[PDB]
Design a protein around this ligand. Structure first.
Ligand SMILES: CC1(C)Nc2nc(N)[nH]c(=O)c2N=C1C(=O)NCCN(CCSC[C@H]1O[C@@H](n2cnc3c(N)ncnc32)[C@H](O)[C@@H]1O)CP(=O)(O)O
Length: 158
């Protein structure tokens, strides 16, 4: 199963955080990175008080069940997610989202695949389009089509 995972960090200095994440993704049991998108600097979706995000996409080969993979992604967000300031630990600044898990459709308490809002999110679609441009969604929609129809702005590389 090729799972596609979206990575986000909004630290002022997220490069170290994202790289630590990609190694942890790589250390997940029965899983390894096939491909990594470029790193992108995106303006945040939401209050524009918070810093710019570093966004990227990752193709992950895995023999894991989807919920099992999720446990792993949430563990990493717990482990690599926060980083120390001198006083205390800071809030977590790693987001690992499962955009797709093979051709599977999933709707549960814990999991919604495809990711529920990725279709309105340029910072998810473009990096993905870079590593899987002929990607077809389980309902037959094409990633290229959705980028075509909405005409999202391209991303500046980080
Ligand atoms: C958006 C916002 C503020 N602005 C941004 N702007 C830019 N430029 N770039 C960004 O990156 C970016 N992201 C920011 C963000 O705040 N991101 C949080 C992502 N956050 C999903 C994490 S899972 C929490 C719960 O979600 C359940 N969950 C359900 N399905 C899945 C799934 N398929 N994969 C993973 N977790 C699943 C899971 O059980 C857990 O308990 C909520 P959401 O944005 O609404 O996606």
């Amino acid at each position: 199963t090729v799972a596609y995972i979206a990575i986000g960090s909004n630290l002022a200095s997220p490069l170290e955080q994202v790289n630590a994440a990609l190694k942890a993704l790589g250390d997940i049991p029965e899983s390894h990175i096939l491909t990594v998108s470029s790193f992108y600097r995106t303006p945040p979706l939401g209050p524009q008080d918070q810093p710019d995000y570093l966004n990227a996409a990752v193709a992950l080969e895995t023999s894991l069940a989807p919920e099992e993979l999720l446990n792993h992604t949430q563990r990493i967000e717990l482990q690599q997610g926060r980083v120390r300031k001198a006083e205390r630990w800071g809030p977590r600044t790693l987001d690992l989202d499962i955009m797709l898990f093979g051709n599977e459709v999933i709707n549960t308490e814990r999991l919604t695949v495809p990711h529920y809002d990725m279709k309105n999110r340029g910072f998810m679609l473009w990096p993905l389009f870079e590593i899987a441009p002929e990607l077809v969604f389980p309902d037959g929609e094409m990633l290229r089509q959705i980028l075509h129809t909405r005409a999202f702005d391209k991303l500046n590389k980080w």
